[PDB]
Paper text:
Bromodomains (BRDs) are protein interaction modules that specifically recognize ε-N-lysine acetylation motifs, a key event in the reading process of epigenetic marks. The 61 BRDs in the human genome cluster into eight families based on structure/sequence similarity. Despite large sequence variations, all BRD modules share a conserved fold that comprises a left-handed bundle of four α helices (αZ, αA, αB, αC), linked by loop regions of variable length (ZA and BC loops), which line the Kac binding site and determine binding specificity. The four helices form a deep cavity that is extended by the two loop regions (ZA and BC loops), creating a largely hydrophobic Kac binding pocket.
The most notable structural difference within the BRD core fold is a hairpin insertion located between helix αZ and the ZA loop that is present in all family VIII members. The proximity to the Kac binding site suggests that this insert may play a role in recruitment of acetylated binding partners. Helix αZ is flanked by a diverse sequence region and a β hairpin insert present in all family VIII BRDs.
Author numbering: 41 to 154
Amino acid sequence: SMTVDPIAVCHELYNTIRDYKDEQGRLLCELFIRAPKRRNQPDYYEVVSQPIDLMKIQQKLKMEEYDDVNLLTADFQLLFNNAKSYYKPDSPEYKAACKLWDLYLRTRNEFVQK
């Protein structure tokens, strides 16, 4: 719709990512629940400067911080870009990042289309 309620749309988009299974029945978001701890993953933090995960995004959602769809988009962009920065194209993480990002955008586009 051209006239949307961002708080509502952001809740739906989070739920989309939270609940999605691929055709193999894999709950792809499970790979993104927790980012590696800084003090336990020096290789990851050589290539990732600002970590984020679904725990953080869920907390922000609960705190009502997503009142602009662009803010949620930026957080998922970071979430998936960080994964693609460390993990290589053949990895489950990279593949799931590409798939969930594309799902995010497609779902978003249906909510905010003219």
